Amino acid sequence: RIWNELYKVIDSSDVVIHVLDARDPLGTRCKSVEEYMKKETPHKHLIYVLNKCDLVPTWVAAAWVKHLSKERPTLAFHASITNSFGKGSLIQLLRQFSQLHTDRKQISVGFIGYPNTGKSSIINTLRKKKVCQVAPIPGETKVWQYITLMKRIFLIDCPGIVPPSSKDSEEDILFRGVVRVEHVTHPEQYIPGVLKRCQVKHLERTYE
Amino acid sequence: EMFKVIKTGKSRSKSWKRMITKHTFVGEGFTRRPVKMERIIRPSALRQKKANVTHPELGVTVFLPILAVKKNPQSPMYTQLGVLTKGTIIEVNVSELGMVTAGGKVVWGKYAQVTNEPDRDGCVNAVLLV
Amino acid sequence: NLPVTVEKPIPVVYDLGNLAAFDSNVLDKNDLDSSNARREEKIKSLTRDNVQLLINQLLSLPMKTTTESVGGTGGQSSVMTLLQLPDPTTDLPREKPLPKAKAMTKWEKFAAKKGIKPKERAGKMIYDEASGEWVPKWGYKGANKKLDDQWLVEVDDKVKGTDNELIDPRTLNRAERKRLVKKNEKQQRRNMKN
Amino acid sequence: SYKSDQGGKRLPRIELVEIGPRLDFKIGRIHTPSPDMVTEAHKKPKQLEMKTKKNVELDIMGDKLGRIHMGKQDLGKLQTRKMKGLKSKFDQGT
Amino acid sequence: GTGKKEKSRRIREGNLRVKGENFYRDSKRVKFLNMYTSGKEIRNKKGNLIRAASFQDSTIPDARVQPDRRWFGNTRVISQDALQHFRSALGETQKDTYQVLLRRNKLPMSLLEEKDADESPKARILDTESYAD
Ligand SMILES: Nc1nc2c(ncn2[C@@H]2O[C@H](COP(=O)(O)OP(=O)(O)O)[C@@H](O)[C@H]2O)c(=O)[nH]1
Numbered sequence: 001r002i003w004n005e006l007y008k009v010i011d012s013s014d015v016v017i018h019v020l021d022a023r024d025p026l027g028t029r030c031k032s033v034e035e036y037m038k039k040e041t042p043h044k045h046l047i048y049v050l051n052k053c054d055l056v057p058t059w060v061a062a063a064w065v066k067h068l069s070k071e072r073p074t075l076a077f078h079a080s081i082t083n084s085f086g087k088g089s090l091i092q093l094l095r096q097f098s099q100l101h102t103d104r105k106q107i108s109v110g111f112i113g114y115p116n117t118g119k120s121s122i123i124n125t126l127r128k129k130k131v132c133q134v135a136p137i138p139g140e141t142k143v144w145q146y147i148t149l150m151k152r153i154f155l156i157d158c159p160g161i162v163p164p165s166s167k168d169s170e171e172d173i174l175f176r177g178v179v180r181v182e183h184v185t186h187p188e189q190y191i192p193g194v195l196k197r198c199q200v201k202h203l204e205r206t207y208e
Numbered sequence: 209e210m211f212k213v214i215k216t217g218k219s220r221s222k223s224w225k226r227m228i229t230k231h232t233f234v235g236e237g238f239t240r241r242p243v244k245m246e247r248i249i250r251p252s253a254l255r256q257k258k259a260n261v262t263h264p265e266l267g268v269t270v271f272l273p274i275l276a277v278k279k280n281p282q283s284p285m286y287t288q289l290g291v292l293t294k295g296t297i298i299e300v301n302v303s304e305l306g307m308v309t310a311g312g313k314v315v316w317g318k319y320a321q322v323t324n325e326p327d328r329d330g331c332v333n334a335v336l337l338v
Numbered sequence: 339n340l341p342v343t344v345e346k347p348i349p350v351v352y353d354l355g356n357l358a359a360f361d362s363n364v365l366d367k368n369d370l371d372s373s374n375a376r377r378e379e380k381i382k383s384l385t386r387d388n389v390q391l392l393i394n395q396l397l398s399l400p401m402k403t404t405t406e407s408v409g410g411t412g413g414q415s416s417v418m419t420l421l422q423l424p425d426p427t428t429d430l431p432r433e434k435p436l437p438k439a440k441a442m443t444k445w446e447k448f449a450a451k452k453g454i455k456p457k458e459r460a461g462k463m464i465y466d467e468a469s470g471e472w473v474p475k476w477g478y479k480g481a482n483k484k485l486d487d488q489w490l491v492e493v494d495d496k497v498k499g500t501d502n503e504l505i506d507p508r509t510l511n512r513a514e515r516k517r518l519v520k521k522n523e524k525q526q527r528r529n530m531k532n
Numbered sequence: 533s534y535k536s537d538q539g540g541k542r543l544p545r546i547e548l549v550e551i552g553p554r555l556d557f558k559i560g561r562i563h564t565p566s567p568d569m570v571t572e573a574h575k576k577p578k579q580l581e582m583k584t585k586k587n588v589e590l591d592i593m594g595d596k597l598g599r600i601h602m603g604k605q606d607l608g609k610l611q612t613r614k615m616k617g618l619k620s621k622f623d624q625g626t
Numbered sequence: 627g628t629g630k631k632e633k634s635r636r637i638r639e640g641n642l643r644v645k646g647e648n649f650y651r652d653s654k655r656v657k658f659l660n661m662y663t664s665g666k667e668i669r670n671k672k673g674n675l676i677r678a679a680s681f682q683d684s685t686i687p688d689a690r691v692q693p694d695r696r697w698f699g700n701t702r703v704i705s706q707d708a709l710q711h712f713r714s715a716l717g718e719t720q721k722d723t724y725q726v727l728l729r730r731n732k733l734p735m736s737l738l739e740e741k742d743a744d745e746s747p748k749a750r751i752l753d754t755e756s757y758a759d
């Protein structure tokens with residue numbers, strides 16, 4: 001059902017935005033969908049938006065934008081209805097895409113990526129209104145949703161996707177914010193991964 | 209037969225969307241129209257890109273990519289929708305057959321006629337028009 | 339082995355599309371006046387210098403080569419190498435004004451208003467079902483004129499009560515056809531006047 | 533044309549031979565055109581050339597391409613989230 | 627208000643007008659917005675079909691293809707010079723990350739995608755020696 005929705009939004013989208021987590025962008029990349037888009041639908045324009053850039057240091061976001069721009073146009077972003085970053089840049093980029101496709105009477109921008117990376121949040125930020133449901137629990141978006149940004153620009157919200165892999169373990173999936181922790185059996189066995197991924201001084205400041 | 213009525217609305221009270229039940233060729237750079245204004249539906253599973261073309265010369269069949277739909281004998285509307293039924297004239301890429309004109313030009317596009325029913329057998333069969 | 343490099347105080351400008359070279363240097367009338375014996379040599383030497391520079395530019399132009407043999411359409415054969423002349427720089431007057439657009443006719447405006455897309459014009463052949471033949475729908479041996487040669491026509495009952503009862507239905511159809519054609523011509527003349 | 537032996541085999545020495553006619557024209561009289569007639573005679577069609585479109589190009593392979601422009605992304609105007617674990621006031625073991 | 631009448635509005639700005647054409651919609655707008663209520667069949671008192679639903683007409687067409695010499699000609703040809711041009715150009719293209727593909731040119735890519743390879747595929751052993759042998 002989710003992958004049927006994803007292929008429907010891709011088939012409907014002229015522009016596709018891949019939303020990445022600024023804390024682990026390569027971990028949140030969907031390389032298989034990028035390959036499929038480059039092979040079967042080369043006329044669709046795929047770009048990167050690096051969301052949650054407020055959760056990393058400034059230079060980390062700058063370096064990630066620099067390294068991802070060698071592959072695709074990348075825009076750093078902080079999603080928020082009231083206090084956002086990058087909203088004007090994203091809007092003027094979509095205006096450029098519309099002006100390129102002036103032959104089409106309207107264009108559609110489909111938002112794809114991992115669950116909980118902030119796709120609904122970015123759409124809400126562009127609208128300046130809570131038009132899409134936002135929650136930290138995965139599977140909050142279950143079907144696609146059309147949002148009119150301007151008369152010539154539509155935005156398509158999509159449910160989150162997780163491409164299957166053999167190298168990625170359950171630990172990696174869990175630390176990418178994909179699963180509901182309340183349904184996992186023994187979380188103490190995943191706590192050492194938290195200690196590995198977090199700085200000790202930061203942990204002791206968070207928990208006193 | 210060609211179209212299936214698609215009902216919309218919570219109580220299924222609207223009936224303006226139509227779905228094509230036959231196989232289609234949508235061409236390069238196809239993007240679906242937005243769902244609010246999409247009257248004609250051409251689902252992706254029924255879209256074809258390649259055909260089994262039989263050459264009367266040398267009696268060989270090759271799997272060739274479809275370039276265009278030239279003439280659907282049922283209607284010019286089905287021609288412009290790209291419907292592939294029996295007897296449809298298509299344009300095929302004949303590059304791997306190695307044809308040369310009398311002037312030394314390489315032929316890479318010719319016409320073929322669909323000889324089967326792809327809605328019944330799941331594939332497109334065509335005979336080259338030579 | 340005289341040189342091919344020509345020195346000029348003011349550079350020559352070129353129009354390689356028209357094969358022209360313009361030099362605006364100082365020309366002294368003492369050597370070009372009719373009272374001089376070296377005027378022809380002077381003119382020839384300056385023309386030689388300008389033509390030499392022009393030839394250097396022409397041979398510096400990019401060149402088109404082909405691989406097709408003789409005997410085909412095109413006029414360039416494999417052994418020939420042609421020069422690619424740029425577009426002419428000098429602007430010259432035209433002999434006639436540009437063709438102005440034809441104004442939109444009454445039919446074209448009606449089609450724009452009523453959403454009538456222009457027809458496909460696939461061909462002029464139609465299938466006549468009573469026979470097994472593809473025949474032209476108009477023109478020489480057209481299907482619009484089969485009624486004139488039809489062996490038997492039933493006289494319509496509406497023709498009764500009139501003075502046109504006794505006339506040939508084929509003649510009536512020919513008159514109607516000519517009336518329609520002349521009306522089309524009159525409409526074209528009206529669109530021409532507008 | 534002759535071999536020059538100084539410009540190689542690709543650049544020859546040119547010479548001229550007069551053919552005729554040789555004419556000397558004295559400029560008797562002039563009749564210039566009007567400026568509006570000049571503009572009418574020098575109007576170009578523009579119907580045959582492809583129109584120039586901004587940020588649209590045709591590459592060597594014949595693909596139509598469009599260029600986009602990101603603009604400046606100044607990350608110095610972004611305030612990072614002031615998380616509790618980044619505060620020295622909650623220091624332990626001191 | 628006589629200036630708010632439909633007749634007066636038209637003169638300020640005969641059989642071609644349609645229902646619902648007003649200050650807010652013209653004829654094309656009216657028919658496009660009637661698409662959303664269009665697709666139903668019409669039946670009378672006795673039940674006969676006054677009009678079929680849109681795209682649901684049941685008349686069987688007489689589907690024929692006429693004889694024509696256009697069917698047997700070449701539709702696309704390419705010259706040797708053009709083949710050499712595109713074969714050389716495919717390889718000298720340098721992709722920019724800020725250029726997007728708006729439209730792809732139509733070319734014989736099987737002819738054009740010919741690359742020199744250092745190694746050959748392995749031979750087919752079943753031609754010389756079958757399983758039974
Ligand atoms: N700090 C921070 N949190 C964010 C940002 N964007 C989204 N979030 C949070 O991440 C969670 C998931 O957001 P959501 O929009 O539902 O992600 P989606 O599954 O991709 O649609 C929400 O609780 C958001 O508040 C951001 O830019 N910064």
Ligand SMILES: [K+]
Pocket residue numbers: 115116134135136137138139140141
């Ligand atoms: K979510």
Ligand SMILES: [Mg+2]
Pocket residue numbers: 119120121133134140141158
């Ligand atoms: Mg969501």
